[PDB]
Design a protein around this ligand. Sequence first.
Ligand code: CL
Lengths: 147, 147, 148
Amino acid sequence: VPTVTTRAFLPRLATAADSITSTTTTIALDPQTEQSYWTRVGDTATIHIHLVGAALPAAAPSTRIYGNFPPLRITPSSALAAQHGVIVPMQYYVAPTLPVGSSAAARIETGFIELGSLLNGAFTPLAANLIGTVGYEFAIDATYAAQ
Amino acid sequence: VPTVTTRAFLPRLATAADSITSTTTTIALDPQTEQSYWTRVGDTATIHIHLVGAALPAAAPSTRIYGNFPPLRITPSSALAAQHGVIVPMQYYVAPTLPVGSSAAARIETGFIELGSLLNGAFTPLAANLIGTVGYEFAIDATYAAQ
Amino acid sequence: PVPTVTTRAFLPRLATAADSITSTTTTIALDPQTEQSYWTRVGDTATIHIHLVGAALPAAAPSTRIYGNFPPLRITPSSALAAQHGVIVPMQYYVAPTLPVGSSAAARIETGFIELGSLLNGAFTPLAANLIGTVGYEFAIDATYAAQ
Ligand SMILES: [Cl-]
């Protein structure tokens, strides 16, 4: 018999040297303006993330969101590459710099959510100094199955 | 304990002078061919909207859908701009005219759903005379958390 | 009534066809798979995860489809003179396909099957089976929709 659980949470923005390592640097957050939350009913998780900041993080190849949202159900893939995840679009209120022809996207993994871009079905991580213009403001909305 | 509610509903197509105003014009609908519906289980809402019409509405800057679907859960934003919402793709069976490089999209807000286009994560409202060719036919499919 | 939750692994069946309407299909022999495909349904809300990998592209055909026991999409059946109306979603490629210029990778979810294709100005176009990869293929489809 299903339960429903709905919680506000505080996403943690963090950067890393690549899309594989568990070593990260936490980015200090300005005061936020829009509540981030998640809900889970049965094994179905829906997340809403919004973050705003006045200054872009220092340059790093991987830009991630951590938090207590339900962990994605997916078979763990090879440790030699980024873990397989679910690719979703995302929204920018302040313009990022994306590769030509690509759309704004995020890779939802069991361990974290990575910001990036999408072209011909392929996800490419977005560097932390390119996720906005001077500062940043973006949102991620998605539904996926939890473990 | 969660409940499940699944209902057919009659979407209302309406246009407005901008993406903020509460002044709207309801568009008279042709007989519809496909059932529009929503379902809510716990706080998770899934909507299916389909509308067909033989003649495009009179040109207006904002094209909106109203109905009794579960209201989006999101922090209300400034009244000086369109309310923050969830951006989703949408489907056209009759071709629209979109900005170059953009994808067909919809902005789901607590108050209504707005048709538009999506480029580099940014949503732009689509004018009512551009949502088709002579006539129109489109669908919007999404899942989001409700209040 | 009170909602139930059902979560199940499943074995997607890859099939090709001569168009996007016909019930005539050719089942494609699958390699050993590396990632579990599954679906879950709570109330009338279905979420699917499909992953398929193969060393060799299927023989060329205009429609590339996935069949399985996932919850059937709730949608009014449309004219038999065209592909059934469905829900269009994005999809992911681990091995590069050949898509129409300017289009994004997409899938069309129908009550009867899921079809691979591309998306441009809101319009879905089916993708031929000899173009769903390079030499071989590897892709994933993730979606949530209402079931009947
Ligand atoms: Cl089968």
